[PDB]
Amino acid sequence: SVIKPDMKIKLRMEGAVNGHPFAIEGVGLGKPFEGKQSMDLKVKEGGPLPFAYDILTTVFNRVFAKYPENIVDYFKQSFPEGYSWERSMNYEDGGICNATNDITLDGDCYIYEIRFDGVNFPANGPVMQKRTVKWEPSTEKLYVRDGVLKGDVNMALSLEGGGHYRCDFKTTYKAKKVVQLPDYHFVDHHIEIKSHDKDYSNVNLHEHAEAHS
């Protein structure tokens, strides 16, 4: 198998929020079979970012999810060729973010080509006012539709003044080659920013995920 116990990550995100462009690059590593990963992200263009960094984190690869033997693993099956995903993130106050990631593999390193575009975030909302604290752990629901895999998840950002800010994720996963399709299942997620500098020019991000049925 081309999927090894320890692998690397390299990525570049180009995007915009409310019409303002930025670019971020990252380098990381993870354990595909353990469903754990971490990475260091650096803002290359558009800094200091004028919006809450948290809207970007779930965009910075389900290959990093611990899949039990009794569940078909769409993602690990997609390599060496790889897969891509598309996602729309609908926030409760109307902010909408669309993102995509084309994932390839070079040796023991996954390569991500990411696009991120958010619009209509209210000027005095939690995202433009940087009042988000972190994402709560979640459970993604995955199901097949028209030969590809869909993943939906109810997400929530804890807020500075207390309370939560909701967002609904709708993701479409597409293997580059034909692979076996899985039956309905779930993936528990927990993403966390472990460290960052004042203006988030530098961020260390971690995530651990496990599938179940």
Side-chain angles (χ1 to χ4, degrees):
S1 176
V2 304
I3 306 298
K4 285 64 180 62
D6 292 283
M7 292 195 255
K8 319 288 265 189
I9 304 163
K10 284 194 304 188
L11 66 85
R12 179 174 168 85
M13 167 190 279
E14 275 177 24
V17 171
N18 284 8
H20 297 283
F22 65 94
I24 298 173
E25 289 183 358
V27 178
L29 53 57
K31 299 174 176 293
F33 301 104
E34 288 175 47
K36 297 180 174 178
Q37 59 173 137
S38 69
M39 59 175 65
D40 289 306
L41 297 150
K42 295 191 180 186
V43 176
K44 307 295 293 187
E45 299 168 39
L49 299 181
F51 57 83
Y53 204 93
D54 289 316
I55 67 173
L56 306 174
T57 60
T58 64
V59 175
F60 294 127
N61 181 358
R62 209 69 56 258
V63 78
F64 290 106
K66 183 179 183 182
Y67 266 84
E69 307 177 304
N70 69 327
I71 300 177
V72 175
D73 192 336
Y74 187 77
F75 310 100
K76 291 189 178 72
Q77 270 185 282
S78 76
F79 294 88
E81 302 81 0
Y83 71 104
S84 64
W85 58 256
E86 301 155 35
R87 183 187 303 161
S88 194
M89 296 162 275
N90 181 193
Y91 291 86
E92 64 175 304
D93 60 354
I96 311 296
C97 293
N98 284 172
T100 63
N101 189 358
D102 186 14
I103 305 176
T104 52
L105 177 65
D106 183 359
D108 64 356
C109 189
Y110 294 103
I111 306 298
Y112 309 166
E113 187 189 308
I114 294 164
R115 180 71 211 178
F116 185 97
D117 297 274
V119 301
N120 292 334
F121 277 108
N124 306 312
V127 173
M128 298 315 296
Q129 292 288 148
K130 295 176 181 175
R131 286 187 283 102
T132 69
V133 177
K134 67 185 309 187
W135 287 106
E136 291 291 354
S138 70
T139 298
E140 172 177 25
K141 278 69 186 297
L142 297 93
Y143 54 104
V144 171
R145 178 166 298 183
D146 304 326
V148 293
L149 186 64
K150 300 291 185 174
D152 296 345
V153 56
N154 287 315
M155 295 284 283
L157 279 163
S158 173
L159 300 179
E160 177 62 41
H164 286 80
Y165 172 53
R166 289 266 292 104
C167 179
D168 286 343
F169 281 21
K170 285 192 175 178
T171 309
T172 298
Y173 302 100
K174 300 177 179 175
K176 270 130 180 176
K177 303 301 179 171
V178 61
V179 302
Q180 192 172 60
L181 298 173
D183 292 310
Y184 199 90
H185 67 285
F186 317 82
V187 175
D188 288 338
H189 295 268
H190 193 11
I191 188 168
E192 299 173 285
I193 287 182
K194 285 294 183 177
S195 69
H196 65 79
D197 49 16
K198 205 328 222 73
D199 59 9
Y200 294 74
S201 294
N202 291 89
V203 172
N204 181 65
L205 184 63
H206 293 229
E207 193 219 326
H208 71 85
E210 290 190 45
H212 60 271
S213 64

